[PDB]
Design a binder for these strands. Structure first.
Lengths: 774, 236, 147, 131, 129
RNA sequence: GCCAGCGAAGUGAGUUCAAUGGCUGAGGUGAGGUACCCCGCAGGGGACCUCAUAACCCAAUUCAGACUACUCUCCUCCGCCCAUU
RNA sequence: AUAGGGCGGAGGGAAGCUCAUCAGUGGGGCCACGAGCUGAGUGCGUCCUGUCACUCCACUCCCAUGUCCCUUGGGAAGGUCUGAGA
């Protein structure tokens, strides 16, 4: 019975070794204070015991036997004085308490969390839920006649190049649009700025005779640029109160801002609303469930029967109309149908669905991070397919927060957020949500989702982000019910991984334009030059020996002038964001294979052909251009920011064909004749006591852009990081057209996007796969 | 990443042979080959059907690591003392084309020179037991590393004798000064049913021989992979 | 103010299972500390004796866990192949076999023992083919799901 | 305008909201395409052998996949039987996955024609049967 | 390109052999056979036969026999299908001389039935739409 | 003066009987040398060779700030004494 | 005057080498879709008949169970206080 007796020993070997590791995780050196989860650890557990839970406090009372001045000032008037400098949003007391606050081009906003959550933000974005605070995006309301709000803007969006908004007739009632503005119709290809655009007209008039509104959602670096362009294009004309608006805006309220003037001839009313209402970007698959379960629609049947004692009479006149009563039931029925919808990835293109919401702090669950899955009922199959295919909620889309006098009355009541918190201590409800409702906060909001990676065919729905638009008075009061459901909130760095893993460039300054990108790249050059002079030598690698001007991303004032001097010798800062020509450029770099006739498939359903004369006609049509490229490393690579893309040679393709997993060649070092002027400078500085060009700065950038390195450099990388989506290094940067079509003409054969890259801190060429996914 | 490919010198009976296979399958071994002792005393040529492992073993080699079947090979170990016996290896290379990897045991430095240059073998048996005078010369080593020829070091010091422990560690270090570790394997003979060591146990036993700090792990994995890779083109 | 340890696993793989019944912490500490003095000299016999101690040993299973330092793990882990002739009242010939050298970290050293134990009982199913032993495997799977 | 020049993005195919709940007590694996084959079977092996380490306990796994994915989602399941070597019962369940395609060119006079399409899926369910 | 395929529905087709079902086969790749097999699958609802339809498929046909049985579920609405997953050995010989190689492709077979699975399903689990 | 918490998977290191600053080779910077090459202003640059790269010290939930222990190093401010003109 | 040699003090929101191969180790990441669900074409059957055959036409080859990717002890991690993550 040795084979039987050996089974009892090997079974207990799996039992004891499993119990030695399971109890010890719950023991933690037999300590109660270290048994808590690592997200729920506070170091003030010894001074005051009240920072602990109730059931864990009873053991700590038994452990207590074994183990600066006051402040009496009006803090509201203190923060009112501090708001004169910055903008100071309503949710600043939430963010500054637990985030690293860094002042920027606008105001100070949250960038990085104090707790380490870099892997946690991506994990709460593809599986769990997440939401942000993006309130710096301004809006420009333009009131005017329909014939005048399009003729002054038709020479600004460039109809035949990108997405249109003028007469597309589908982005009008149903959904929103996204496009890039320009200058006046003289066609300069100089000034450009991305704007997510929204149309809405009233359905029951159905004619261009009523009031038509439209908003310009923009970035605060473009706020000096867009507002001065629309002004130039259309017409050359007690108690303690909370300062919900700005102090910069209210201090300029009499002379200049908000810019609300009228036009005599065109009737265009420019309504500058920089901080008039707040915006929250809610991103995630489970973000579609906490938007449905926590937010409840306002009961229009309960209030409008007999209760009439108090204003909010603007909703009473709405409840008096019988058409709006049946319409609010249709707005709630699709909103309750959103619980049947499992994810916001399948909803066609930026839909808009506004409804009236009774405020979600009525529920306010006692537990923290109370995450719930879906119910097991999955009925109503025909109702889901009605919204997936058509997706036309024009009757249900009723943006009621676009009225001027009604939105003032939302903020006019000045409700207290702490006095309602006492109501749960006065009523003493143990486990019920009982709030008396003769008059409640029956104010509407707006729901707009955003798709991610539409042009790229890799994921098709990575960034699925809702936007909850709401007035200015309802700030942190609407923030706090989402926190107790299981949301981990990122900042600006989490707003930076939102675009670099979605293969779109960042909106503040990473794309090079004339008014905006030159100011942020200089601001980017002031941060790392301070960090470069901060570190003493023999600790940092030198940059004259290894590469070129780096990590300072401004040689493209002369780099794009150099690549046209190479071709044409044998209008500036142009970006080819024209998706009709990007379909052709995707065919050259994307498919790199050959089986019978075409790349990766023999039918293709397209046009395959080699014509080098038509490629030269594109270069003469668009001179001095610059196109972004998404690129994918194969193996053994890690992209940094500001890394250089280098053209491979003929010997690089022969070695990779001979051996797989072959690391690229190294770089021969370059001579540094600027060292002799350093001891000339140091000995002259000490002579005059008894132009700062030390270790990589010089104003001589002309001959290096021609031919300096061994491999010819052609492109840069702005967003350089390793991806958690693909599983390897995924860089993102900008190249030129003449750099591509010189490489593409050399290889009509097998793989073409195999182009080496070289980081400036290293000397090792590493190859990636260029593929333009538009 | 094909790991733990060593060779055994084992034939007495089917009970002692299968016990070494099941023990090597237990530890880490995915390639186990059986060597045959051929010398100048009896002068026997049993090439066609020496063991027929695939016709005797019960068709299931199972390891507890990667959980893959074991590629069992057949290798030959020729003990050569006189140069007249070395001409037998050049005559049987075209008559019977079996024994995929061929290992030869030289004894004379004049015969060691033609073994590294002229004689077509795959591995070189280097065992020094009980005062065997054989010194190493640097030009016959420098040709064999460029050719791809490997060198064996068969050890069994822990059970039989304590005097044999010193000759295996001293004759090894005479080779480590010259060969530098380009292609060196360390296999072990096993006559008793327990004369084998573990898969990661060889990695410190190569460091016990010196020779490296990291490449001693590659002496059981990488240099043992080059024996079948170079010997396959010799057969075809 | 703390020392970095190394924890190496061993396994006795041999026939005649009366040798597996004759295992003790007093015998194992007198075996390993003696065979280092037989292979190495008095240097490694005491440089691998100031941190060397036994922590985990099952005579019915055959898993040996030993202690050693960061500076002296290469002397114990090289003395493991030269351990023969466990002298006792009978005739015994065991020989240790390493599995994975764990750098400290007892928790994942016990995790590798679980995955080694699970792979041993799955191969044992078809090779043994016993009705009374297969019911004992079902007692091992069911009690492991209750953990 | 579906012949000359038109953008054609594919939006998404609904799986369920279940993969917020399914990685707690069971384990679910969505087999993709053009990533790797050797990596995907290794992810099936580690997640099946994770006891009190993976999520809570190793009990059972099952594998999803769409019409291209089920050519290789069946490949990782049958190789697990010879790999894990134990009694693992395989049960499969087929269903219909709806697929809404949107195509819309950059033209004022055009409107996005939303096509209807369906695709086949499988639910290969691997038990842990006591031998 | 000469294949040699063995058959490894082995024990389960015992009670199916007494009913004489209509077997439906999809070898590797054939597009117009989808219009041909569904012509008889629709006819098998009208022709007098028992509720037993036998599908098969391997290689690349394992993703086409699922779509073939799915369209018949939109017409016949069967309530029980047994999908079995078994090794299928394919030994093809292609010319480079003649080279032989053994391939172990996955297989799939769908057994649409309605009446015969009433004492069945201890652990078989057919889906019931 | 006094009053407010959540047992629930997974920290760009995340261990908890307490993992991780590794080796070799090639560089950077800081000294020293040239029978070597190029540019021709006695000069300079490149190539090659030798050597230094540390001390203080260790993550146990994390972050900001103060304080303290520091030198392979760089920047600013100076003192003392020697020698020279 | 020559900060020429030697030494010492005070101060900074000073900083405390990098890169390539290989190895060890704790982890993390590693995307449900081929416009193939009445798909297309070829030769016969046939113009209504296909237990029709062929094309990895969309290469995904391979005894297929990671030779995949990234990171892994600091400026003060050390004490030891104040403050935040309600």
């Amino acid at each position: 019975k040795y084979i039987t007796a050996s089974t009892f020993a090997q079974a207990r070997a799996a039992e004891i070794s499993a119990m030695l590791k399971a109890v010890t995780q719950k023991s933690s050196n037999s300590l109660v204070f270290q048994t808590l989860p690592r997200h729920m650890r506070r170091r003030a557990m010894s001074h005051n015991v009240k920072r602990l839970p109730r059931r864990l406090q009873e053991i700590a009372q038994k452990e207590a036997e074994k183990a600066a001045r006051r402040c009496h000032m009006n803090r509201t008037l203190e923060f009112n004085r501090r708001q004169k400098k910055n903008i100071w949003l309503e949710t600043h007391i939430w963010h500054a308490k637990r985030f690293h606050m860094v002042k920027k081009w606008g105001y100070c906003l949250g960038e990085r969390p104090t707790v380490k959550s870099h892997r946690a933000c991506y994990r709460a974005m593809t599986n769990r839920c997440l939401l942000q605070d993006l309130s710096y995006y301004c809006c420009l309301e333009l009131k005017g006649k329909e014939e005048e709000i399009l003729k002054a803007l038709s020479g600004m969006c460039n109809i035949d190049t990108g997405l249109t908004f003028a007469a597309v007739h589908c982005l009008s009632g149903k959904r929103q649009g996204s496009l890039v503005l320009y200058r006046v119709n003289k066609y300069p290809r100089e000034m450009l700025g991305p704007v997510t655009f929204i149309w809405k007209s009233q359905r029951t008039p159905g004619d261009p005779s009523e009031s038509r509104q439209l908003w310009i959602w923009l970035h605060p670096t473009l706020k000096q640029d867009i507002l001065e362009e629309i002004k130039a294009a259309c017409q050359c004309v007690g108690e303690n109160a909370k300062p919900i608006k700005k102090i910069i805006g209210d201090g300029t309220r009499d002379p200049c801002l908000p810019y609300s003037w009228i036009s005599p001839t065109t009737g265009i009313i420019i309504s500058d609303l920089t901080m008039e209402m707040n915006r929250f970007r809610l991103i995630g698959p489970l973000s579609h469930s906490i938007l449905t379960e926590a937010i409840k629609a306002a009961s229009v049947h309960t209030v409008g029967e007999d209760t009439e004692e108090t204003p909010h009479r603007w909703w009473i006149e709405t409840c008096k109309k019988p058409d709006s009563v049946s319409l609010h039931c249709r707005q709630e029925a699709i909103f309750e149908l959103l619980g049947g919808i499992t994810s916001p990835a399948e909803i066609p293109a930026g839909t808009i669905l506004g409804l009236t919401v009774g405020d979600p702090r009525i529920n306010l669950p006692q537990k923290k991070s109370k995450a719930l899955p879906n119910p097991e009922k999955c009925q109503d199959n025909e109702k889901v397919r009605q919204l997936l295919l058509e997706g036309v909620p024009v009757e249900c889309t009723h943006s009621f927060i676009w009225n001027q006098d009604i939105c003032k009355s939302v903020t006019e009541n000045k409700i207290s957020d702490q006095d309602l918190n006492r109501m749960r201590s006065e009523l003493l409800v143990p486990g019920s949500q009982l709030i008396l409702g003769p008059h409640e906060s029956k104010i509407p909001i707006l729901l707009i989702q955003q798709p991610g990676k539409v042009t790229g065919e890799d994921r098709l729905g990575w960034g699925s982000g809702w936007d909850v638009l709401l007035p200015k008075g309802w700030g942190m009061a609407f923030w706090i019910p989402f926190i107790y459901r299981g949301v981990r909130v990122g900042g600006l760095k989490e707003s930076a991984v939102h675009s670099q893993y979605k293969r779109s460039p960042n909106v503040p300054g990473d794309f090079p334009d004339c008014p905006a990108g030159m100011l942020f790249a200089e601001e980017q050059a002031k941060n790392l030059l301070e960090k470069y002079k901060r570190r003493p030598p023999a600790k940092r690698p030198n940059y004259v020996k290894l590469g070129t001007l780096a990590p300072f991303c401004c040689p493209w004032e002369q780099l794009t002038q150099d690549w046209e001097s190479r071709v044409q010798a044998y209008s500036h800062l142009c970006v080819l964001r024209s998706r009709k020509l990007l379909k052709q450029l995707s065919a050259w770099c994307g498919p790199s294979s050959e089986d019978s006739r075409g790349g990766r498939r023999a039918p293709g359903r397209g046009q395959q052909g080699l014509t080098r004369e038509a490629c030269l006609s594109i270069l003469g049509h668009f001179p001095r251009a610059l196109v972004w490229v998404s690129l994918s490393l194969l193996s053994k690579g890690s992209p940094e920011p500001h890394t250089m893309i280098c053209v491979p040679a003929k010997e690089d393709f022969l070695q990779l064909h001979e051996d797989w997993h072959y690391c690229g060649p190294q770089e021969s070092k370059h001579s540094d004749p600027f060292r002799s002027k350093i001891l000339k400078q140091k000995e002259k500085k000490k002579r005059e006591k008894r132009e700062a060009l030390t270790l990589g700065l010089w104003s001589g950038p002309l001959p290096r852009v021609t031919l300096h390195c061994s491999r010819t450099l052609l492109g840069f990388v702005t967003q350089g990081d390793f991806s958690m989506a693909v599983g390897c290094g995924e860089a993102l940067g900008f190249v030129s057209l003449t750099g591509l079509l010189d490489m593409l003409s050399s290889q009509p054969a097998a793989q073409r996007g195999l182009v080496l890259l070289r980081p400036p801190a290293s000397l090792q060429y590493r190859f990636a796969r260029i593929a333009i996914e538009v | 990443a094909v790991f733990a490919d060593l060779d055994l010198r084992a034939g007495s009976d089917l009970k002692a042979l299968r016990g070494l296979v099941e023990t090597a399958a237990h530890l880490g071994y995915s390639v186990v080959a059986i060597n045959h002792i051929v010398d100048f005393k009896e002068k026997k040529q049993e090439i066609e059907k020496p063991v027929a492992v695939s016709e005797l073993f019960t068709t299931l080699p199972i390891v507890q690591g990667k959980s893959r079947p074991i590629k069992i090979l057949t290798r030959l170990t020729i003990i050569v003392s006189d140069p007249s016996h070395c001409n037998v290896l050049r005559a049987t290379s075209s008559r019977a084309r079996l024994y995929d990897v061929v290992a030869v045991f030289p004894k004379t430095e004049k015969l060691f020179h033609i073994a590294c240059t002229h004689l077509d073998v795959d591995l070189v048996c280097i065992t020094v037991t009980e005062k065997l005078p054989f010194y190493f010369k640097r030009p016959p080593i420098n040709v064999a590393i460029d050719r791809g020829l490997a060198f064996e070091l068969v050890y069994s010091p822990a059970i039989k004798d304590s005097t044999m422990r010193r000759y295996t560690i001293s004759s090894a270090l005479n080779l480590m000064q010259i060969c530098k570790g380009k292609n060196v394997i360390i296999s072990s003979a096993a006559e008793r049913p327990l004369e084998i060591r573990g898969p990661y146990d060889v990695a410190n036993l190569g460091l016990l021989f010196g020779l490296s700090e990291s490449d001693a792990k590659a002496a059981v994995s990488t240099n043992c992979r080059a024996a079948l890779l170079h010997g396959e083109t010799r057969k075809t | 103010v703390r020392f970095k340890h190394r924890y190496l696993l061993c396994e006795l793989v041999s026939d005649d299972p009366r040798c597996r019944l004759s295992l003790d912490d007093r015998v194992l500490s007198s075996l390993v500390r003696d065979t280092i003095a037989r292979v190495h000299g008095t240097f490694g016999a005491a440089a691998c004796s100031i941190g060397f101690a036994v922590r985990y040993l099952n005579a019915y299973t055959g898993i040996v866990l030993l202690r050693c330092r960061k500076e002296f793990y290469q002397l114990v882990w090289s003395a493991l192949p030269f351990i023969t002739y466990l002298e006792n009242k009978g005739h015994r010939y065991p020989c240790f076999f390493n599995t994975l050298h764990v750098g400290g970290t007892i928790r994942t050293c016990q995790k590798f023992l679980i995955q080694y134990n699970r792979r041993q009982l799955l191969i044992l199913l078809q090779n043994c083919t016993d009705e009374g032993e297969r019911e004992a495997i079902q007692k091992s799977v069911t009690r492991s799901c209750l953990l | 305008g579906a012949v000359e020049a038109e953008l054609d993005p594919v939006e998404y195919t609904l799986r369920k909201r279940l993969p917020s709940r399914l990685p707690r007590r069971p384990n679910d694996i969505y087999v993709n395409m053009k990533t790797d084959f050797k990596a995907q079977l290794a992810r099936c092996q580690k997640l099946l052998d994770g006891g009190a380490r993976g999520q809570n306990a190793c009990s059972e796994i099952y594998i999803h996949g769409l019409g291209l994915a089920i050519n290789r989602a069946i490949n990782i399941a049958l190789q697990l039987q010879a790999g894990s070597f134990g009694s693992l019962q395989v049960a499969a369940n087929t269903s219909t996955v709806e697929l809404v395609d949107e195509l819309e060119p950059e033209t004022d006079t055009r409107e996005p024609l939303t096509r209807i399409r369906n695709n086949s899926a499988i639910h290969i369910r691997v038990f842990r049967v006591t031998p | 390109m000469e294949n040699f395929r063995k058959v490894r529905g082995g024990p389960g087709s015992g009670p199916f052999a007494d009913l004489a079902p209509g077997a439906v086969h999809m070898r590797v790749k054939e597009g117009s056979k989808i219009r041909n097999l569904m012509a008889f699958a629709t006819a098998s609802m009208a022709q007098p036969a028992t509720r037993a339809i036998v599908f098969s498929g391997c290689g690349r046909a394992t993703t086409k026999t699922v779509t073939c049985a799915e369209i018949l579920k939109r017409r016949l609405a069967g309530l029980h299908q047994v999908t079995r997953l078994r090794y299928r050995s394919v030994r093809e010989v292609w010319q480079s001389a003649s080279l032989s190689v053994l391939k172990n492709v996955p297989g799939l077979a769908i057994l649409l039935s309605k009446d015969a699975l009433d004492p069945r399903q201890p652990g078989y689990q057919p889906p019931n739409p």
